[PDB]
């Protein structure tokens, strides 16, 4: 990583040797990556999301740009890491919590809001920068992904996936995503 605290460079290591500095690539190249990724995971997975997955990539790229214009990978907080891994982990976790069967646009946008938050929101230290990231995501979303209703991440229930109220007996090892269990549902099934 670039020189910061423990990060540094010895001059002689590149005495008669060349170094190839590598850092963030271009935003449109990143979108050439992630648009076809969203194709192969939502356009190639769900028809109800095949009809809006494009703006999802847009809601991804512009939001991530706003957040990294507002917060820095390794300059103010080592609790931060803005890189390819931002949207990489967003899309991988989009490809990991697909259970809660038959993702409508509501649930795909739910899981994506989860991905973006969990890569950026509790990456963040307190209330105000939390709200800044929230403003970025709500703006970028309701410009781009604002056609069918998908924000059931929040108004439906907490942005969660429920298993301790809907499991399988022995292999809770990998708990099963069934985010259709309510407040006292959980609060009473769990004391069992």
């Amino acid at each position: 990583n670039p020189t910061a605290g423990s990060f540094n460079i010895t001059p002689r290591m590149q005495r008669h040797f060349v170094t190839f500095a590598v850092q963030m690539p271009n935003a449109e190249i990143t979108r050439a990556m992630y648009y076809q990724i969203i194709d192969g995971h939502f356009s190639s997975f769900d028809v109800d999301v095949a009809k809006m997955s494009n703006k999802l990539v847009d809601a991804t790229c512009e939001l991530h740009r706003n957040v990294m214009h507002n917060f820095l990978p390794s300059a103010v907080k080592f609790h931060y890491q803005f890189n390819l891994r931002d949207l990489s982990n967003i899309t991988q976790g989009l490809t990991r919590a697909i259970k809660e069967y038959y993702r409508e646009p509501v649930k795909v946008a739910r899981l994506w809001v989860h991905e973006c938050e969990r890569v950026f929101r509790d990456r963040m230290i307190n209330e105000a920068d939390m709200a800044k990231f929230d403003e970025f995501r709500v703006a970028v979303t309701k410009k781009f992904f604002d056609d069918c209703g998908g924000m059931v991440a929040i108004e439906e229930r907490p942005l969660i996936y429920a298993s301790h109220a809907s499991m399988t007996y022995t292999p809770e090892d990998v708990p099963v995503y069934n985010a259709l269990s309510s407040y006292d549902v959980l609060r009473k099934t769990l004391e069992d």
Binding site: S163, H164, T170, P171, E172, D173, V174, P175, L190
Partner: protein
């Protein structure tokens, strides 16, 4: 509390080393090695 609530009641055994103020780091790390062999060779569903 909620950590083992989730993890234990999500089936990944909550592996933790029996530790005191002077319990062996050697024994700690060897039990960790046991954990390693379990998770790797056995594919044991764990959460350390």
């Amino acid at each position: 509390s909620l950590a083992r609530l989730a993890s234990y009641i999500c089936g990944y055994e909550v592996y933790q080393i029996s530790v005191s103020s002077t319990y062996g780091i050697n024994d700690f790390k060897e039990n960790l090695l046991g954990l390693y062999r379990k998770a790797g060779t056995k594919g044991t569903p764990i959460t350390f």
